[PDB]
Amino acid sequence: ATSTKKLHKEPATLIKAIDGDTVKLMYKGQPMTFRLLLVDTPSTKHPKKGVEKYGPEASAFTKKMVENAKKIEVEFDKGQRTDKYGRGLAYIYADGKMVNEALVRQGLAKVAYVYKPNNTHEQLLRKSEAQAKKEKLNIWSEDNADSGQ
């Protein structure tokens, strides 16, 4: 144990946001498609239901935060650097805000089956998910999941 600086950030710039959990950015002068991996968004392409535009969904959320970002950094984990489908596996930081956590904490993304050993910030997302759940944020909001009394 005993480590300084959790994981490693590499400089990036957005080319296009494919959707919420999958983006294509310019990684060191070359276009690489990245998937956030730990997070998985529901109904990925369209709003949850579609009755008025309540919920810009992860697609626009990720897009907006990375476009407004001064700095875009991709943080690669301890495991594999790229996904089975050749997507980059990194925690993308938009302006220093980790997109993964931001999607989850606001309730636009859920924690999925994280492909270990790529899991350093799984815990962070897990708590942020639980956070979103107890506040019934947009994907946890009374619609698909309408639980209570």
Side-chain angles (χ1 to χ4, degrees):
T2 308
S3 303
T4 309
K5 186 186 65 175
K6 60 189 73 63
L7 301 180
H8 68 107
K9 275 65 64 187
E10 305 297 291
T13 304
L14 184 74
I15 296 180
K16 53 180 300 185
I18 302 183
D19 209 291
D21 58 66
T22 313
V23 297
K24 194 173 185 175
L25 54 69
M26 192 177 301
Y27 175 65
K28 299 179 177 174
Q30 58 182 30
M32 184 179 298
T33 310
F34 283 75
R35 193 182 188 226
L36 285 61
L37 179 65
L38 286 55
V39 307
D40 180 82
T41 56
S43 302
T44 315
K45 189 64 184 182
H46 59 261
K48 285 76 67 179
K49 179 178 294 175
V51 294
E52 291 296 283
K53 301 299 177 62
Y54 284 95
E57 268 51 301
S59 318
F61 193 99
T62 302
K63 186 177 188 294
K64 263 67 291 301
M65 65 182 301
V66 298
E67 297 186 278
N68 284 268
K70 314 308 166 298
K71 62 168 184 172
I72 305 185
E73 306 180 273
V74 300
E75 185 181 80
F76 295 98
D77 199 271
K78 75 195 73 172
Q80 52 182 90
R81 185 172 65 238
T82 42
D83 172 71
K84 184 182 183 183
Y85 291 87
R87 280 62 171 167
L89 297 179
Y91 303 82
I92 304 179
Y93 290 64
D95 203 271
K97 301 85 176 188
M98 59 292 294
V99 180
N100 281 272
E101 192 273 318
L103 302 182
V104 180
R105 73 181 186 201
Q106 186 58 89
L108 300 77
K110 302 183 181 179
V111 180
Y113 294 89
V114 177
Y115 187 75
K116 298 165 186 291
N118 291 35
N119 64 148
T120 304
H121 304 263
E122 174 186 80
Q123 307 184 150
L124 178 64
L125 304 182
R126 198 170 181 162
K127 65 186 296 178
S128 292
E129 177 187 79
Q131 189 182 272
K133 289 175 175 172
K134 57 77 180 178
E135 301 191 53
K136 302 183 296 175
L137 294 175
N138 70 93
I139 64 178
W140 305 108
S141 182
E142 303 88 293
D143 190 270
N144 174 86
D146 179 58
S147 300
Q149 296 177 330

mmCIF file with all atom_site columns, all heavy atoms in Angstrom, residues 84-103:
data_model
loop_
_atom_site.group_PDB
_atom_site.id
_atom_site.type_symbol
_atom_site.label_atom_id
_atom_site.label_alt_id
_atom_site.label_comp_id
_atom_site.label_asym_id
_atom_site.label_entity_id
_atom_site.label_seq_id
_atom_site.pdbx_PDB_ins_code
_atom_site.Cartn_x
_atom_site.Cartn_y
_atom_site.Cartn_z
_atom_site.occupancy
_atom_site.B_iso_or_equiv
_atom_site.pdbx_formal_charge
_atom_site.auth_seq_id
_atom_site.auth_comp_id
_atom_site.auth_asym_id
_atom_site.auth_atom_id
_atom_site.pdbx_PDB_model_num
ATOM 1   N N   . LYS A 1 84  ? -12.873 -4.257  -24.238 1.00 0.00 ? 84  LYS A N   1
ATOM 2   C CA  . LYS A 1 84  ? -12.920 -5.386  -25.158 1.00 0.00 ? 84  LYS A CA  1
ATOM 3   C C   . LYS A 1 84  ? -13.273 -4.928  -26.592 1.00 0.00 ? 84  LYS A C   1
ATOM 4   O O   . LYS A 1 84  ? -12.837 -5.530  -27.572 1.00 0.00 ? 84  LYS A O   1
ATOM 5   C CB  . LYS A 1 84  ? -14.000 -6.339  -24.639 1.00 0.00 ? 84  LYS A CB  1
ATOM 6   C CG  . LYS A 1 84  ? -14.160 -7.647  -25.385 1.00 0.00 ? 84  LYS A CG  1
ATOM 7   C CD  . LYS A 1 84  ? -15.306 -8.437  -24.782 1.00 0.00 ? 84  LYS A CD  1
ATOM 8   C CE  . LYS A 1 84  ? -15.484 -9.787  -25.438 1.00 0.00 ? 84  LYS A CE  1
ATOM 9   N NZ  . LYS A 1 84  ? -16.641 -10.504 -24.879 1.00 0.00 ? 84  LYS A NZ  1
ATOM 10  N N   . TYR A 1 85  ? -14.042 -3.858  -26.704 1.00 0.00 ? 85  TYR A N   1
ATOM 11  C CA  . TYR A 1 85  ? -14.435 -3.322  -27.997 1.00 0.00 ? 85  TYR A CA  1
ATOM 12  C C   . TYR A 1 85  ? -13.527 -2.158  -28.424 1.00 0.00 ? 85  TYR A C   1
ATOM 13  O O   . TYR A 1 85  ? -13.857 -1.393  -29.328 1.00 0.00 ? 85  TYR A O   1
ATOM 14  C CB  . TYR A 1 85  ? -15.912 -2.897  -27.977 1.00 0.00 ? 85  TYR A CB  1
ATOM 15  C CG  . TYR A 1 85  ? -16.883 -4.057  -27.872 1.00 0.00 ? 85  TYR A CG  1
ATOM 16  C CD1 . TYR A 1 85  ? -17.264 -4.576  -26.639 1.00 0.00 ? 85  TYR A CD1 1
ATOM 17  C CD2 . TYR A 1 85  ? -17.411 -4.637  -29.015 1.00 0.00 ? 85  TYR A CD2 1
ATOM 18  C CE1 . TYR A 1 85  ? -18.142 -5.639  -26.555 1.00 0.00 ? 85  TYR A CE1 1
ATOM 19  C CE2 . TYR A 1 85  ? -18.284 -5.699  -28.942 1.00 0.00 ? 85  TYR A CE2 1
ATOM 20  C CZ  . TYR A 1 85  ? -18.648 -6.198  -27.713 1.00 0.00 ? 85  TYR A CZ  1
ATOM 21  O OH  . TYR A 1 85  ? -19.514 -7.275  -27.642 1.00 0.00 ? 85  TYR A OH  1
ATOM 22  N N   . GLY A 1 86  ? -12.394 -2.029  -27.769 1.00 0.00 ? 86  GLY A N   1
ATOM 23  C CA  . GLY A 1 86  ? -11.415 -1.027  -28.142 1.00 0.00 ? 86  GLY A CA  1
ATOM 24  C C   . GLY A 1 86  ? -11.796 0.380   -27.742 1.00 0.00 ? 86  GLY A C   1
ATOM 25  O O   . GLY A 1 86  ? -11.429 1.348   -28.417 1.00 0.00 ? 86  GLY A O   1
ATOM 26  N N   . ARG A 1 87  ? -12.562 0.497   -26.691 1.00 0.00 ? 87  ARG A N   1
ATOM 27  C CA  . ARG A 1 87  ? -12.892 1.795   -26.128 1.00 0.00 ? 87  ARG A CA  1
ATOM 28  C C   . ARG A 1 87  ? -11.916 2.074   -25.003 1.00 0.00 ? 87  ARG A C   1
ATOM 29  O O   . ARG A 1 87  ? -11.436 1.154   -24.392 1.00 0.00 ? 87  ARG A O   1
ATOM 30  C CB  . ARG A 1 87  ? -14.340 1.852   -25.572 1.00 0.00 ? 87  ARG A CB  1
ATOM 31  C CG  . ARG A 1 87  ? -15.477 2.060   -26.587 1.00 0.00 ? 87  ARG A CG  1
ATOM 32  C CD  . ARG A 1 87  ? -15.604 0.948   -27.614 1.00 0.00 ? 87  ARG A CD  1
ATOM 33  N NE  . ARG A 1 87  ? -16.833 1.092   -28.417 1.00 0.00 ? 87  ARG A NE  1
ATOM 34  C CZ  . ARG A 1 87  ? -17.110 0.427   -29.551 1.00 0.00 ? 87  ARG A CZ  1
ATOM 35  N NH1 . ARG A 1 87  ? -16.209 -0.354  -30.110 1.00 0.00 ? 87  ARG A NH1 1
ATOM 36  N NH2 . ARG A 1 87  ? -18.292 0.551   -30.121 1.00 0.00 ? 87  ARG A NH2 1
ATOM 37  N N   . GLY A 1 88  ? -11.603 3.304   -24.757 1.00 0.00 ? 88  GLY A N   1
ATOM 38  C CA  . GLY A 1 88  ? -10.726 3.619   -23.665 1.00 0.00 ? 88  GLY A CA  1
ATOM 39  C C   . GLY A 1 88  ? -11.457 3.515   -22.350 1.00 0.00 ? 88  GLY A C   1
ATOM 40  O O   . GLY A 1 88  ? -12.645 3.866   -22.271 1.00 0.00 ? 88  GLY A O   1
ATOM 41  N N   . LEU A 1 89  ? -10.786 3.014   -21.345 1.00 0.00 ? 89  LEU A N   1
ATOM 42  C CA  . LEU A 1 89  ? -11.368 2.869   -20.037 1.00 0.00 ? 89  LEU A CA  1
ATOM 43  C C   . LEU A 1 89  ? -10.728 3.858   -19.117 1.00 0.00 ? 89  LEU A C   1
ATOM 44  O O   . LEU A 1 89  ? -9.632  3.619   -18.593 1.00 0.00 ? 89  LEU A O   1
ATOM 45  C CB  . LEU A 1 89  ? -11.173 1.450   -19.496 1.00 0.00 ? 89  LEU A CB  1
ATOM 46  C CG  . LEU A 1 89  ? -11.844 0.326   -20.279 1.00 0.00 ? 89  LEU A CG  1
ATOM 47  C CD1 . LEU A 1 89  ? -11.542 -1.016  -19.648 1.00 0.00 ? 89  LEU A CD1 1
ATOM 48  C CD2 . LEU A 1 89  ? -13.336 0.551   -20.352 1.00 0.00 ? 89  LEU A CD2 1
ATOM 49  N N   . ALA A 1 90  ? -11.365 4.978   -18.953 1.00 0.00 ? 90  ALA A N   1
ATOM 50  C CA  . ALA A 1 90  ? -10.818 6.017   -18.151 1.00 0.00 ? 90  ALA A CA  1
ATOM 51  C C   . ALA A 1 90  ? -11.906 6.812   -17.494 1.00 0.00 ? 90  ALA A C   1
ATOM 52  O O   . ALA A 1 90  ? -13.029 6.906   -17.999 1.00 0.00 ? 90  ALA A O   1
ATOM 53  C CB  . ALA A 1 90  ? -9.946  6.936   -18.996 1.00 0.00 ? 90  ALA A CB  1
ATOM 54  N N   . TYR A 1 91  ? -11.580 7.365   -16.372 1.00 0.00 ? 91  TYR A N   1
ATOM 55  C CA  . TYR A 1 91  ? -12.450 8.239   -15.668 1.00 0.00 ? 91  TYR A CA  1
ATOM 56  C C   . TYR A 1 91  ? -12.206 9.606   -16.229 1.00 0.00 ? 91  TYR A C   1
ATOM 57  O O   . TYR A 1 91  ? -11.143 10.171  -16.044 1.00 0.00 ? 91  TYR A O   1
ATOM 58  C CB  . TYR A 1 91  ? -12.130 8.257   -14.178 1.00 0.00 ? 91  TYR A CB  1
ATOM 59  C CG  . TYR A 1 91  ? -12.173 6.919   -13.489 1.00 0.00 ? 91  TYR A CG  1
ATOM 60  C CD1 . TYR A 1 91  ? -11.092 6.060   -13.549 1.00 0.00 ? 91  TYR A CD1 1
ATOM 61  C CD2 . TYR A 1 91  ? -13.273 6.528   -12.750 1.00 0.00 ? 91  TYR A CD2 1
ATOM 62  C CE1 . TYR A 1 91  ? -11.100 4.859   -12.898 1.00 0.00 ? 91  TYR A CE1 1
ATOM 63  C CE2 . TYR A 1 91  ? -13.290 5.315   -12.099 1.00 0.00 ? 91  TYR A CE2 1
ATOM 64  C CZ  . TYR A 1 91  ? -12.199 4.484   -12.178 1.00 0.00 ? 91  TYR A CZ  1
ATOM 65  O OH  . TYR A 1 91  ? -12.180 3.294   -11.484 1.00 0.00 ? 91  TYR A OH  1
ATOM 66  N N   . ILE A 1 92  ? -13.131 10.100  -16.957 1.00 0.00 ? 92  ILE A N   1
ATOM 67  C CA  . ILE A 1 92  ? -12.960 11.373  -17.578 1.00 0.00 ? 92  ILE A CA  1
ATOM 68  C C   . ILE A 1 92  ? -13.314 12.505  -16.624 1.00 0.00 ? 92  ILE A C   1
ATOM 69  O O   . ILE A 1 92  ? -14.383 12.497  -15.985 1.00 0.00 ? 92  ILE A O   1
ATOM 70  C CB  . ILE A 1 92  ? -13.763 11.446  -18.891 1.00 0.00 ? 92  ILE A CB  1
ATOM 71  C CG1 . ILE A 1 92  ? -13.310 10.279  -19.785 1.00 0.00 ? 92  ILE A CG1 1
ATOM 72  C CG2 . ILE A 1 92  ? -13.547 12.796  -19.595 1.00 0.00 ? 92  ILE A CG2 1
ATOM 73  C CD1 . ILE A 1 92  ? -14.008 10.183  -21.107 1.00 0.00 ? 92  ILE A CD1 1
ATOM 74  N N   . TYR A 1 93  ? -12.392 13.412  -16.478 1.00 0.00 ? 93  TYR A N   1
ATOM 75  C CA  . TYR A 1 93  ? -12.559 14.581  -15.674 1.00 0.00 ? 93  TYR A CA  1
ATOM 76  C C   . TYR A 1 93  ? -12.794 15.754  -16.589 1.00 0.00 ? 93  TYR A C   1
ATOM 77  O O   . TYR A 1 93  ? -11.952 16.077  -17.435 1.00 0.00 ? 93  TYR A O   1
ATOM 78  C CB  . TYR A 1 93  ? -11.298 14.851  -14.819 1.00 0.00 ? 93  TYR A CB  1
ATOM 79  C CG  . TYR A 1 93  ? -11.045 13.869  -13.686 1.00 0.00 ? 93  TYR A CG  1
ATOM 80  C CD1 . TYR A 1 93  ? -10.773 12.531  -13.930 1.00 0.00 ? 93  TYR A CD1 1
ATOM 81  C CD2 . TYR A 1 93  ? -11.066 14.295  -12.365 1.00 0.00 ? 93  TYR A CD2 1
ATOM 82  C CE1 . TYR A 1 93  ? -10.544 11.652  -12.897 1.00 0.00 ? 93  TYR A CE1 1
ATOM 83  C CE2 . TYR A 1 93  ? -10.828 13.416  -11.329 1.00 0.00 ? 93  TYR A CE2 1
ATOM 84  C CZ  . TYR A 1 93  ? -10.570 12.094  -11.601 1.00 0.00 ? 93  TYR A CZ  1
ATOM 85  O OH  . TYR A 1 93  ? -10.344 11.205  -10.567 1.00 0.00 ? 93  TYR A OH  1
ATOM 86  N N   . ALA A 1 94  ? -13.901 16.392  -16.409 1.00 0.00 ? 94  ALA A N   1
ATOM 87  C CA  . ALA A 1 94  ? -14.249 17.548  -17.163 1.00 0.00 ? 94  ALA A CA  1
ATOM 88  C C   . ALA A 1 94  ? -14.100 18.719  -16.263 1.00 0.00 ? 94  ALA A C   1
ATOM 89  O O   . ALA A 1 94  ? -14.854 18.855  -15.304 1.00 0.00 ? 94  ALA A O   1
ATOM 90  C CB  . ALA A 1 94  ? -15.683 17.454  -17.636 1.00 0.00 ? 94  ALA A CB  1
ATOM 91  N N   . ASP A 1 95  ? -13.070 19.505  -16.507 1.00 0.00 ? 95  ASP A N   1
ATOM 92  C CA  . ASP A 1 95  ? -12.768 20.736  -15.751 1.00 0.00 ? 95  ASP A CA  1
ATOM 93  C C   . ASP A 1 95  ? -12.420 20.360  -14.301 1.00 0.00 ? 95  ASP A C   1
ATOM 94  O O   . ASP A 1 95  ? -12.476 21.171  -13.375 1.00 0.00 ? 95  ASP A O   1
ATOM 95  C CB  . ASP A 1 95  ? -13.987 21.671  -15.793 1.00 0.00 ? 95  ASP A CB  1
ATOM 96  C CG  . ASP A 1 95  ? -13.673 23.117  -15.566 1.00 0.00 ? 95  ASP A CG  1
ATOM 97  O OD1 . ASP A 1 95  ? -13.669 23.577  -14.404 1.00 0.00 ? 95  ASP A OD1 1
ATOM 98  O OD2 . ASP A 1 95  ? -13.476 23.830  -16.550 1.00 0.00 ? 95  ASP A OD2 1
ATOM 99  N N   . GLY A 1 96  ? -12.030 19.113  -14.126 1.00 0.00 ? 96  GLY A N   1
ATOM 100 C CA  . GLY A 1 96  ? -11.703 18.612  -12.822 1.00 0.00 ? 96  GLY A CA  1
ATOM 101 C C   . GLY A 1 96  ? -12.864 17.896  -12.163 1.00 0.00 ? 96  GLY A C   1
ATOM 102 O O   . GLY A 1 96  ? -12.700 17.289  -11.097 1.00 0.00 ? 96  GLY A O   1
ATOM 103 N N   . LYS A 1 97  ? -14.029 17.959  -12.778 1.00 0.00 ? 97  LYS A N   1
ATOM 104 C CA  . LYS A 1 97  ? -15.182 17.258  -12.264 1.00 0.00 ? 97  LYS A CA  1
ATOM 105 C C   . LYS A 1 97  ? -15.238 15.898  -12.931 1.00 0.00 ? 97  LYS A C   1
ATOM 106 O O   . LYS A 1 97  ? -15.310 15.819  -14.158 1.00 0.00 ? 97  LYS A O   1
ATOM 107 C CB  . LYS A 1 97  ? -16.519 18.006  -12.524 1.00 0.00 ? 97  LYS A CB  1
ATOM 108 C CG  . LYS A 1 97  ? -16.658 19.424  -11.942 1.00 0.00 ? 97  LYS A CG  1
ATOM 109 C CD  . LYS A 1 97  ? -16.080 20.512  -12.854 1.00 0.00 ? 97  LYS A CD  1
ATOM 110 C CE  . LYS A 1 97  ? -16.337 21.900  -12.272 1.00 0.00 ? 97  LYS A CE  1
ATOM 111 N NZ  . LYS A 1 97  ? -15.979 23.004  -13.202 1.00 0.00 ? 97  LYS A NZ  1
ATOM 112 N N   . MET A 1 98  ? -15.180 14.838  -12.158 1.00 0.00 ? 98  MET A N   1
ATOM 113 C CA  . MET A 1 98  ? -15.228 13.513  -12.732 1.00 0.00 ? 98  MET A CA  1
ATOM 114 C C   . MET A 1 98  ? -16.643 13.199  -13.233 1.00 0.00 ? 98  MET A C   1
ATOM 115 O O   . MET A 1 98  ? -17.594 13.089  -12.440 1.00 0.00 ? 98  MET A O   1
ATOM 116 C CB  . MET A 1 98  ? -14.663 12.409  -11.781 1.00 0.00 ? 98  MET A CB  1
ATOM 117 C CG  . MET A 1 98  ? -15.356 12.248  -10.421 1.00 0.00 ? 98  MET A CG  1
ATOM 118 S SD  . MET A 1 98  ? -15.119 13.636  -9.279  1.00 0.00 ? 98  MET A SD  1
ATOM 119 C CE  . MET A 1 98  ? -13.365 13.540  -8.949  1.00 0.00 ? 98  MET A CE  1
ATOM 120 N N   . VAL A 1 99  ? -16.755 13.070  -14.557 1.00 0.00 ? 99  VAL A N   1
ATOM 121 C CA  . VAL A 1 99  ? -18.026 12.864  -15.277 1.00 0.00 ? 99  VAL A CA  1
ATOM 122 C C   . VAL A 1 99  ? -18.803 11.688  -14.706 1.00 0.00 ? 99  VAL A C   1
ATOM 123 O O   . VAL A 1 99  ? -19.998 11.797  -14.462 1.00 0.00 ? 99  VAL A O   1
ATOM 124 C CB  . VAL A 1 99  ? -17.778 12.636  -16.799 1.00 0.00 ? 99  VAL A CB  1
ATOM 125 C CG1 . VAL A 1 99  ? -19.083 12.418  -17.544 1.00 0.00 ? 99  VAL A CG1 1
ATOM 126 C CG2 . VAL A 1 99  ? -17.025 13.811  -17.406 1.00 0.00 ? 99  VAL A CG2 1
ATOM 127 N N   . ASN A 1 100 ? -18.088 10.590  -14.454 1.00 0.00 ? 100 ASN A N   1
ATOM 128 C CA  . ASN A 1 100 ? -18.677 9.361   -13.886 1.00 0.00 ? 100 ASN A CA  1
ATOM 129 C C   . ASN A 1 100 ? -19.529 9.655   -12.670 1.00 0.00 ? 100 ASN A C   1
ATOM 130 O O   . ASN A 1 100 ? -20.688 9.267   -12.607 1.00 0.00 ? 100 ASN A O   1
ATOM 131 C CB  . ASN A 1 100 ? -17.594 8.334   -13.480 1.00 0.00 ? 100 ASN A CB  1
ATOM 132 C CG  . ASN A 1 100 ? -17.006 7.538   -14.627 1.00 0.00 ? 100 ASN A CG  1
ATOM 133 O OD1 . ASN A 1 100 ? -17.520 6.507   -14.983 1.00 0.00 ? 100 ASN A OD1 1
ATOM 134 N ND2 . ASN A 1 100 ? -15.899 7.984   -15.178 1.00 0.00 ? 100 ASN A ND2 1
ATOM 135 N N   . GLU A 1 101 ? -18.968 10.397  -11.740 1.00 0.00 ? 101 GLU A N   1
ATOM 136 C CA  . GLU A 1 101 ? -19.617 10.653  -10.492 1.00 0.00 ? 101 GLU A CA  1
ATOM 137 C C   . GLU A 1 101 ? -20.745 11.646  -10.684 1.00 0.00 ? 101 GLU A C   1
ATOM 138 O O   . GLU A 1 101 ? -21.799 11.505  -10.104 1.00 0.00 ? 101 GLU A O   1
ATOM 139 C CB  . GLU A 1 101 ? -18.573 11.135  -9.493  1.00 0.00 ? 101 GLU A CB  1
ATOM 140 C CG  . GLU A 1 101 ? -19.035 11.188  -8.062  1.00 0.00 ? 101 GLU A CG  1
ATOM 141 C CD  . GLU A 1 101 ? -19.699 12.465  -7.663  1.00 0.00 ? 101 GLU A CD  1
ATOM 142 O OE1 . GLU A 1 101 ? -19.211 13.566  -8.050  1.00 0.00 ? 101 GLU A OE1 1
ATOM 143 O OE2 . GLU A 1 101 ? -20.668 12.405  -6.906  1.00 0.00 ? 101 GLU A OE2 1
ATOM 144 N N   . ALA A 1 102 ? -20.521 12.600  -11.554 1.00 0.00 ? 102 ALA A N   1
ATOM 145 C CA  . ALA A 1 102 ? -21.490 13.651  -11.838 1.00 0.00 ? 102 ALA A CA  1
ATOM 146 C C   . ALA A 1 102 ? -22.781 13.086  -12.441 1.00 0.00 ? 102 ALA A C   1
ATOM 147 O O   . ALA A 1 102 ? -23.885 13.503  -12.059 1.00 0.00 ? 102 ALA A O   1
ATOM 148 C CB  . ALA A 1 102 ? -20.883 14.715  -12.739 1.00 0.00 ? 102 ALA A CB  1
ATOM 149 N N   . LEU A 1 103 ? -22.640 12.138  -13.367 1.00 0.00 ? 103 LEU A N   1
ATOM 150 C CA  . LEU A 1 103 ? -23.789 11.470  -13.976 1.00 0.00 ? 103 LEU A CA  1
ATOM 151 C C   . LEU A 1 103 ? -24.570 10.705  -12.922 1.00 0.00 ? 103 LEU A C   1
ATOM 152 O O   . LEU A 1 103 ? -25.801 10.778  -12.852 1.00 0.00 ? 103 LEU A O   1
ATOM 153 C CB  . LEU A 1 103 ? -23.335 10.472  -15.061 1.00 0.00 ? 103 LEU A CB  1
ATOM 154 C CG  . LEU A 1 103 ? -22.511 11.031  -16.212 1.00 0.00 ? 103 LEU A CG  1
ATOM 155 C CD1 . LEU A 1 103 ? -22.192 9.937   -17.216 1.00 0.00 ? 103 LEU A CD1 1
ATOM 156 C CD2 . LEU A 1 103 ? -23.237 12.173  -16.874 1.00 0.00 ? 103 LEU A CD2 1
#
